[PDB]
Design a protein around this ligand. Structure first.
Ligand SMILES: [Cl-]
Ligand SMILES: [Mg+2]
Ligand SMILES: [Mg+2]
Ligand SMILES: [Mg+2]
Ligand SMILES: [Mg+2]
Ligand SMILES: [Mg+2]
Ligand SMILES: [Mg+2]
Ligand SMILES: [Mg+2]
Ligand SMILES: [Mg+2]
Ligand SMILES: [Mg+2]
Ligand SMILES: [Mg+2]
Ligand SMILES: [Zn+2]
Ligand SMILES: [Zn+2]
Lengths: 100, 41, 91, 244, 135, 77, 97
RNA sequence: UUGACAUUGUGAAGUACUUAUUCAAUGAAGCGGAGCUGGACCACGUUCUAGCAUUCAAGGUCCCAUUCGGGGCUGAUCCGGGUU
RNA sequence: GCUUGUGACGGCCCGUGAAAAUCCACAGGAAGGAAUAGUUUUCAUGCCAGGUCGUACUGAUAACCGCAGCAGGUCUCCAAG
RNA sequence: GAUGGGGAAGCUCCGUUUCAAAGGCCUGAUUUUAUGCAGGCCACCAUCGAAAGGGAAUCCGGUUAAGAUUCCGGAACCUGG
């Protein structure tokens, strides 16, 4: 039945003032301010979420290694595999049609 | 000869980006330049 | 079991606004909420977003159309007129 | 008396347009060398809703002729235009829905929309949903073109003016009754502050020329001449006739 | 009527080599103990040579004409066949099933393929094979 | 804040030139279903991280304590 | 009548329905004729033609969508492309169809 | 709102011009005239496909004084400097 | 079960429901580069620094405004059986 | 809400990219000294405007008559170099 308070000066329930209730090693309940959840990067062509890419706030990508931000393929962290497949098939067939 | 190849560019409408050409006829000159030229005319 | 005799989708308005006005809204409400065939993939997966915007659930393709139907009668006539005049300038 | 309602709107304080959610001004491309001599191909990226506008808008991407990049154009979408469609604009464009052509390069009876009044003003006529322009004549010697406007008027336009083949999408919108005051409220919430409207006969004489009296009535003819001054032009201005 | 032969040139569609041109060396139509599907043993290009003009000196031309090859077992569904052909008798013996599943034998095959590709690029022939696909 | 489960890397940390202090903690915990055993933890204070090695066998614990470098400040309990 | 000719090969010949199975038959050289629905996307349509050109296979373009091609074959589902492995008691392969 | 005068010039006959003035657009890019090539006065690199298009441009040719490169013409016809 | 967060969905519009700073990926291939030698500080570890102003307390039937220690007025979070 | 400009006898008014010659970061060239000189890049063209919008990074225990996510102990993290 322990009640909690905000730990900052903002007294309103905005998107940047969300809290979670946790229990401390001291045995009491205390509010825990939580950052807004991240959004997965999306494919450039179809707009679907990219597989194999970490989900973080924009500034946090500068701290992680490059292996978390790309895929070992052309357009790795930009376009998904299916859209890359469509690009290659279209490129080959159109250029062949140009010759004929 | 066995490595170099000839790849002419197409500069027609809708084709490759246009090359750099002399645009002295279309230069937006300063105001004082235009006045002294238009005074002559 | 049949729930309403004639109001259909306009039963949400109760007894308000007049029977004639509710009848007019009923005809257009059914069309804008209907499901339409897609001309690109052949499936019955085309529904309306905002007015004049029609998007297929499959094949992720959007077509500009009428306010409450995919294709208006006036637009169908225009396609025939453009087609007839197009063949008179190339052949 | 005091300044009447229609006079106060010119100051533009609370009567300005609400343009926060607008996608952008809908215009054709700038008339350039490719447009006036050949054609240039563009690709429709998406068709999106625009706040305060019944007709949908189309986002079309063209390539820049003079430097390596892409250029974004906002068009008013015609019926039948779809995402992924190629759009051809220029003097030598084909006669297909969505293509932009000069009015002098299309046959008689062609249906067009977003028509330029003068070459290069980027579309002035037939922009609302379901509206179009009919081309009804050519004057090759005078380089003029006769067209019919949505209001029924006949206008003579230069043959170099451009237009888009087809009819503006979203037609039939006004056939559905609003059915309640709430939907009228949300319609004008994204246009401007012109709703609701108070009748002049319900006001006092200080407020409106129709105000006052022990009965609610106008008291003089509501047909007002063209030569009247501000504060007097309330009612039917320069009416040629009245009645049903 | 069958085009999946030992000289057909194909384009890889998936797998870190998507968009890279390749030539079939040994096809296996009716699967195997591993890879229970139609597959081919192929050798391709991982780093295409750069464009060379007459202004480049002898020192820079050699650096720009280097080719980085690779060997891979690829499913038929992940290949896009073409109409071009390329002779494989110069390195057919080194690219095989025994070459794979062994780290030492993989590199020995690749350096053999590298020599054949570079000599093919010199005295220009199969120019389409050595031209990087743009996509 | 970091745990290591290899003795070989533990001795490398004790001579990293930035380590000056260490502590030994003895815990009396119960195993799954047997008699109580003494558990010892070796904690190395690095510049950025604290490394903890935990071993449950007292026989090997005694050897590791002796093998610690003589120039390292070791805190018992 | 293509519909009647296509019906006869169903009950006496060996056919193949669907894009993936048609491509597999083309690679193996067992295909003799492919029928493509009108509303097939051009990119897929051009890919099938390129495979057919390599395998020397005749191509026929059906005058209907995938709904209509499925009905002609005699199925209750849509078919985008039909591959003919061997004709039965029909002469579809030697005529305009 | 209507007339007069000023802004306010140029040519013809019983409307014509341009330079003043006015309107509009473009980070003033292709205007006007001529000349090639083709066709029958017109054209003179782009239309199955949601790919791609950028490093004074490759090539050809003429110079440097050989070194890792640089400089002209052509590629991309001339003429008039009236941005349209 | 209560409060709250979140996921995949569904209904609604002539209403389709901000901007910018800032961070990252890819396309591209200008340059830079090895054999008695170089390059990566997007792998690990190690070194230094992080200024200025606000921070007490009331937040109301007594700390704010209504001439006042005035039954009025004044935005919001936590919520036991 | 300045500047460039146009109004107004004038206090001042209009307008915010506008009929403007509107500005500076990668380095090459120099070992006279510090930046003159050479290709290119970019033309976006003041500034103000949120202690509830956007936003790099901290937690637990203890401590005062009155201070703390700010002090003490321990354990972390970010940015710039
Ligand atoms: Cl009023
Ligand atoms: Mg905030
Ligand atoms: Mg009253
Ligand atoms: Mg009055
Ligand atoms: Mg009156
Ligand atoms: Mg306090
Ligand atoms: Mg007071
Ligand atoms: Mg007071
Ligand atoms: Mg001002
Ligand atoms: Mg500010
Ligand atoms: Mg306190
Ligand atoms: Zn995708
Ligand atoms: Zn569809």
């Amino acid at each position: 039945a322990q009640r909690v308070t905000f730990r900052r000066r903002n007294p309103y329930n905005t998107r940047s003032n969300k809290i979670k209730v946790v229990k401390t090693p001291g045995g009491i309940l205390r509010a825990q301010h939580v950052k807004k959840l991240a959004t997965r990067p999306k494919c450039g062509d179809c707009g679907s979420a990219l597989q194999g890419i970490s989900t973080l706030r924009p500034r946090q990508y500068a701290t992680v290694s490059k292996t978390h931000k790309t895929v070992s393929r052309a357009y790795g962290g930009s376009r998904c595999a299916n859209c890359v497949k469509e690009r290659i098939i279209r490129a080959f067939l159109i250029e062949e049609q140009k010759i004929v | 000869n066995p490595l170099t190849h000839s790849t002419p560019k197409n500069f027609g409408i809708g084709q490759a980006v246009q090359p750099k050409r002399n645009l002295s006829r279309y230069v937006k000159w300063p105001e004082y330049v235009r006045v002294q030229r238009q005074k002559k005319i | 079991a049949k729930r309403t005799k004639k109001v259909g989708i306009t039963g949400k308005y109760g007894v308000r606004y007049g029977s004639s006005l509710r009848r007019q809204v009923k005809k257009l409400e059914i069309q804008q909420h209907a499901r339409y065939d897609c001309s690109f993939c052949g499936k019955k997966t085309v529904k309306r977003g905002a007015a004049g915007i029609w998007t297929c659930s499959c094949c992720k393709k959007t077509v500009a159309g009428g306010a409450y139907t995919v294709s208006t009668a006036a637009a169908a006539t225009v396609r025939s007129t453009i087609r007839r005049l197009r063949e008179m300038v190339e052949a | 008396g005091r300044v009447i309602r229609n006079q106060r709107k010119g100051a533009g304080s609370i009567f300005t347009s609400h343009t926060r959610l607008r996608q952008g001004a809908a215009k054709l491309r700038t008339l350039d060398y490719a447009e006036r001599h050949g054609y240039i191909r563009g690709i429709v990226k998406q068709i999106v809703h625009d706040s305060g506008r019944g007709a949908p808008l189309a986002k079309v991407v063209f390539r820049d002729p003079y430097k390596y990049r892409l250029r974004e154009e906002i068009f008013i979408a015609n019926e039948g235009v779809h995402t992924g469609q190629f759009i051809y604009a220029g003097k030598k464009a084909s006669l297909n829905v969505g293509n932009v052509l000069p009015l002098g390069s299309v046959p008689e009876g062609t249906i067009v929309s977003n028509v330029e009044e003068k070459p290069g003003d980027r579309g002035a006529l037939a922009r609302a949903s379901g509206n179009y322009v009919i081309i009804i004549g050519h004057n090759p010697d005078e380089n003029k073109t006769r067209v019919r406007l949505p209001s029924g008027a006949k206008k003579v336009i230069s043959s170099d003016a451009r237009g888009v083949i087809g009819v503006i999408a979203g037609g039939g919108r006004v056939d559905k009754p609003l059915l309640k005051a709430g939907r009228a409220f949300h319609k004008y919430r994204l246009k401007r502050n012109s709703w609701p409207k108070t009748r002049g006969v319900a006001m006092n004489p200080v407020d409106h020329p129709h105000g006052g009296g022990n009965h609610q009535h106008i008291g003089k003819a509501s047909t007002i001449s063209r030569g009247a001054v501000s504060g007097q032009k309330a009612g039917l201005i320069a009416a040629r006739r009245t009645g049903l | 009527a069958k085009f999946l032969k030992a000289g057909k040139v194909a384009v890889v569609v998936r797998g870190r080599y998507a968009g890279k041109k390749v030539v079939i060396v040994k096809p296996h139509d009716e699967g195997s103990k591993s890879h229970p599907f139609g597959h081919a043993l192929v050798a391709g290009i991982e780093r295409y040579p750069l464009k060379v003009t007459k202004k480049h000196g002898a020192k820079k031309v050699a650096k720009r004409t280097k080719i980085k090859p690779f060997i891979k077992v690829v499913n038929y569904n992940h290949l896009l066949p073409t109409r071009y052909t390329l002779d494989v008798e110069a390195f057919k013996s080194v690219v095989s099933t025994e070459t794979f599943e062994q780290p030492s034998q993989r590199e020995e095959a690749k350096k053999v393929v590298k020599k054949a590709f570079e000599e093919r690029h010199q005295a220009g022939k199969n120019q389409w094979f050595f031209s990087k696909l743009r996509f | 804040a970091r745990e290591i489960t290899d003795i070989k890397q533990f001795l490398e940390l004790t001579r990293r030139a930035d380590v000056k202090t260490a502590t030994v903690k003895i815990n009396k915990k119960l195993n799954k279903a047997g008699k109580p055993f003494r558990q010892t933890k070796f904690k190395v204070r690095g510049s950025s991280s604290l490394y903890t090695l935990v071993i449950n066998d007292a026989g090997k614990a005694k050897k590791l304590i002796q093998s610690l470098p003589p120039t390292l400040k070791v805190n018992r309990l | 009548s293509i519909n009647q000719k296509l019906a006869l090969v169903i009950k006496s010949g060996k056919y193949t329905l669907g894009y993936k199975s048609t491509v597999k038959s083309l690679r193996q050289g067992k295909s003799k004729l492919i029928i493509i629905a009108a509303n097939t996307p051009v990119l897929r349509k051009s890919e099938l033609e390129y495979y057919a050109m390599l395998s020397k296979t005749k191509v026929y373009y059906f005058q209907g969508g995938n709904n209509e091609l499925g009905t002609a074959v005699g199925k209750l589902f849509r078919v985008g492309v039909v591959s003919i492995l061997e004709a039965g008691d029909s002469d579809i392969l030697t005529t305009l169809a």
